[PDB]
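re: that complex we talked abt at group meeting.

here r the seqs, copy pasted straight from the sheet so there may be weird spacing, ignore it
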Amino acid sequence: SGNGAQGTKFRISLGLPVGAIMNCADNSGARNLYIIAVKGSGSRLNRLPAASLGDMVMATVKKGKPELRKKVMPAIVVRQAKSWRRRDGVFLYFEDNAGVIANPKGEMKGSAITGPVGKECADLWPRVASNSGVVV
Amino acid sequence: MGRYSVKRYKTKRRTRDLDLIYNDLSTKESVQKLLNQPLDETKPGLGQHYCIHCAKYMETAIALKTHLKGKVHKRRVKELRGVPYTQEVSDAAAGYNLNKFLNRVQEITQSVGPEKESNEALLKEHLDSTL
Amino acid sequence: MRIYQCHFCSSPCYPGHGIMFVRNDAKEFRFCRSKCHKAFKQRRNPRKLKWTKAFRKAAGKELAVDSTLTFAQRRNVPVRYNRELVATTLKAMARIEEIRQKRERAFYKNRMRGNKEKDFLRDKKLVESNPELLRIREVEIARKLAKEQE
Amino acid sequence: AKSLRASSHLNAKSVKRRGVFQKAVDAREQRISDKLKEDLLKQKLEDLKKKEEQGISTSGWRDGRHHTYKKAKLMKQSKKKTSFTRF
Amino acid sequence: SHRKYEAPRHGHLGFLPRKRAASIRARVKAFPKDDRSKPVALTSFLGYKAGMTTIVRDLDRPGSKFHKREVVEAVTVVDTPPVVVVGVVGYVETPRGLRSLTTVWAEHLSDEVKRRFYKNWYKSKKKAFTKYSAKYAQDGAGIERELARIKKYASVVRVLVHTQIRKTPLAQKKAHLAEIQLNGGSISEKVDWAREHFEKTVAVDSVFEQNEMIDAIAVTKGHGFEGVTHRWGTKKLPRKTHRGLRKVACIGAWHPAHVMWSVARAGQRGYHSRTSINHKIYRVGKGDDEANGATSFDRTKKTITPMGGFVHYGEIKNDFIMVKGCIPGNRKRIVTLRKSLYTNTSRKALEEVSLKWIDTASKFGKGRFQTPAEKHAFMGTLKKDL
Amino acid sequence: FNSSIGRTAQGKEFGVTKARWPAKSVKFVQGLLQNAAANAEAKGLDATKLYVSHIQVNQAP
RNA sequence: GUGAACAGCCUCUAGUUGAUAGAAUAAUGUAGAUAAGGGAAGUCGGCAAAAUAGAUCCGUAACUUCGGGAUAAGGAUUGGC
RNA sequence: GCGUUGGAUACCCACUAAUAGGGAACGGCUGGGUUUAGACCGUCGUGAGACAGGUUAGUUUUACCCUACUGAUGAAUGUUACCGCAAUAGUAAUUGAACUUAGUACGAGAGGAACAGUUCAUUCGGAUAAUUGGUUUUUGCGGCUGUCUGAUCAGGCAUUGCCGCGAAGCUACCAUCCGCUGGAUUAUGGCUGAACGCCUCUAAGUCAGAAUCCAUGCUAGAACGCGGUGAUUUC
RNA sequence: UGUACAACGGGGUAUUGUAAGCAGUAGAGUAGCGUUACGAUCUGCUGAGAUUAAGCCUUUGUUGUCUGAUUUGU
Ligand SMILES: [Mg+2]
Ligand SMILES: [Mg+2]
Ligand SMILES: [Mg+2]
Ligand SMILES: [Mg+2]
Ligand SMILES: [Mg+2]
Ligand SMILES: [Mg+2]
Ligand SMILES: [Mg+2]
Ligand SMILES: [Mg+2]
Ligand SMILES: [Mg+2]
Ligand SMILES: [Mg+2]
Ligand SMILES: [Mg+2]
Ligand SMILES: [Mg+2]
Ligand SMILES: [Mg+2]
Ligand SMILES: [Mg+2]
Ligand SMILES: [Zn+2]
Ligand SMILES: [Zn+2]
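got the structure back, here u go
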């Protein structure tokens, strides 16, 4: 479930395969993130690794500070546009896909997160929960 | 379901909501902030020439003027005339939070509405003067 | 476990049914149906769509302001559990539903008064306007009755 | 990982199985058996009330039909040479 | 030479052949191991799949992230009116296997079960078991001798029961007959139990109870002749490949000069026998309970039947079993419910289910209302009602 | 002469699965049967006791 | 009639109604379509599809044989009364 | 037994429990290649032409035969019907993490486990359709353009005309559920004990022990394997 | 020859979205003498109207139907 994650993670519908671009929801200067790998991904012939909300990915910055560019860094997915089932009994989705830059322990590089953060990701990652202003 | 509706109103191609635009127009400070924006490289027209009603950037002032002279803009202006339809309306139509909805309607009719109307009048005459 | 009302048509949203959309300002839009969700995405006006409760209240098809419609509201200040208070609330809910249904019926009855008068005037004008068809009807009546007689 | 057929996991499972899980199974068995007996008794009472309204050697053959059938079959198998155990 | 990238094979070689099942009633292939000191008990039951609905469960599961939280789950409803005991079969052990030694029937059978013995019931003189029933006269010799034979020789005792299909909404009048093993006391006590229960009914709550794991045995839904892509789950070939893309491109590139049995081929899909295990009984509903669709949290007086009835089935008017999840077979198919072959050591087999709510909205559309009173109360006064 | 013919339930009376309904053949054979009956009546034979004792099909040019 | 139009679509005069049929609706095809989230990760290669499209107005770079490039690109719009 | 990847152009990047080597060719579609006729550049040749070479364009089109394989019927051994047995054949599950054990054993420190008890997920497999999503000839309801039926009405045509919604059915790791436990063993660790007056796990005998083997469980049921049981004909 | 079967009808349950017709003093205005005439549209009667098993559920109604062929013995 990733190093720095808090506990187990139940299955969520996948929305971000490799090659997707999500927004950057933190304040570290990045504008978007390009997914190149997914942590904890399984292996199966022809199957693209994909990420859901609360997953850790390896991402590059395509738009933003040149200091942030040309570097591959961990990011944590805090919003997705693909609908997913909550166990309380509703399917739900956000407007956009969004992630935040972290280190391998899952600590936030930036100081705040703009916009809502999915409850599943916030509950999985304590530092995201500490930097979140809106938890859905 | 059909291709036209799917590719126009796909979630990744969503537009700003009408209650949010109503709140944008209600206060003078929001109006001035949206009228006078910093030079942003990634918006059309360097972030200038922004129509608040349609939440839309135009490339040029002449484009904004031709847009204001249009049935599309007038359609949006007509849409923003009434109560902005929060979840409170649906709750009250179900018969729930009725007093809250009635208080909100009274506040719109007494304070928030006429102030929004005055701001819209001032905004329209400023656009007429500068365009 | 809570019953929600649809953001579009105010219909009840039971657990598992419908879909929720979260906007970037943390506002949840719960929809009971794909029909209502697709209407919201196409940005149609619920106050103009005739099959919604928002329209029906706006146009006065059903009574919107009544003393029975004020008992149900989101309670943000909790009260400690009391068994007899729960029992009294449960009895009151059925009583309030009964009274609200009676007042709804009366409201529809008052809205539909005049219907019989309109129908009678329309029937009278049609009967006054068709003398030839009535003559045909009388001939048919007389022949059928003479057939029964003989 | 340990397979489903892993010895140490199956040993731990058997130790767990002899206790609280078997206790639950046995208690459910007793409850169900009592319900079954009450169901039979209730049927007897209903039938009794309704009728109130109205008012060993196992040697040899099973029957004569069985005697004739098996004798004819064995004679036929002898005649057609189709016996599994006899010539 | 070697395959360059590894992949697991497509499909399961232990579910072969993928042929149509020989019967619409799937066989019970194994019963639980008999414990002689235990009281007498049936090992299985017969029901009809009626449909699915949705529940809310107040979950108690220590160590789980959903501990002390509500979960929304799918359930399956099986219509189970009581079965009627009509016979007993004795089985002996032989070096060639188990052999049925003798069968004893009850004196009187209903036309419901007599129809199972006919292809053309309406034309027949209905003569089945008429001479047999005359063997119950003059102190019942023959019957007593065959029961004595069962007691003297049988190592296994099974009981012949049948469904009361006339209590279901089904158009079929011909009942389903099956053998159900008796696990319990001695052979003599098993036989005495069967003889006492001849022509009597056994209800599902005298076989199962709530919070118990059971197994569902049924024939799956048929789908006719199927291509490889959907029958086996193989990858589609590229667009406009000559002679089709719903194929396996090469069915053999190697020496045996035959097609291997392990190669995917087009054929029958569905209508196979399946035995799925460890389905938890969420509710044992009684047919005369007016609120058997209601819980301690939902105070609405309602039954289990959804508005308009179950689609293609009808209404539930008998005892029913609600198990979580899904079971093989389509609605109105006959299913066999089996007791567990082993003592389950998972804690889910120990959990006590507490339902908060049962969904009774209409399944014939996007049902928004749980009761017709609720629908009428929400909509208001209609034009015809005045 | 039945290679790759369809299967029908009306073959069960004769213990086969492959059976057909050849209308042209049946009409030609019915014509010849009616002629044979006419000839027997002209000879004075009892029509209730008549059975088909020989029937043969050969290939024409 | 629509429309710039011998376009496409519908109609009047005139002319046809010909081409083995019936019943069923498995797989695989041939011809045509739609698809959540992602958006070339597919492939030798964006092959194939999709996207664009009429008209009115605003606006239009390098380069150039000064004639072009040009419908460059990029924008605003379009019903009925 | 069980897996052994996603890309980029044999090497890298990453993910991963791991990204092991090899055979059935090298004793079905398809891209480079034998690539025939067109063409250009280079080297050689007096030349026709050839090549140290380089580049570009270039039609070969079964299956209805037998068999194998996947599924599907079916004669006959009194007839017809219901419930069963099980020879044989196949067989299936896998991997990672988490809580507790614990900040414990161990350690100057820095660090830091496991068994027993619990909870999820990966890959695979079998089902399933309550819900969400996709799909629409339900041509079910409504609308739109053009034209035609004098208008209204109700309709036709536009190779399913087009747009919105759309039940039912089908269906998706795009949805949900479910997937076990007895015997015998390998390496190895032993017991008793000779050979050999010491000794020795081995010679005779014997105890444990691997995701292994044989079973339990699961799929088919021999159309020439079998059992139990019901009825058995009035022109 | 009967909780018989079927064709219709009734009631539910779903889908769409307010039918035809008549009216108004609602309607940018324009023409003629506050009035009349045209006028996209709007409002009311009207969650109306249409559809609803073809693989939905149900049924105290109406009307009908219940009939031929072939073969099998220890
Ligand atoms: Mg691949
Ligand atoms: Mg449904
Ligand atoms: Mg053929
Ligand atoms: Mg798509
Ligand atoms: Mg590529
Ligand atoms: Mg590739
Ligand atoms: Mg150019
Ligand atoms: Mg050449
Ligand atoms: Mg075997
Ligand atoms: Mg452990
Ligand atoms: Mg599947
Ligand atoms: Mg038209
Ligand atoms: Mg020793
Ligand atoms: Mg057999
Ligand atoms: Zn605007
Ligand atoms: Zn709704």
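couple things i noticed - Residues F 4 surround magnesium ion (ligand 3) (CB under 6 Å). Chains D and B do not touch (no CB pair under 8 Å).
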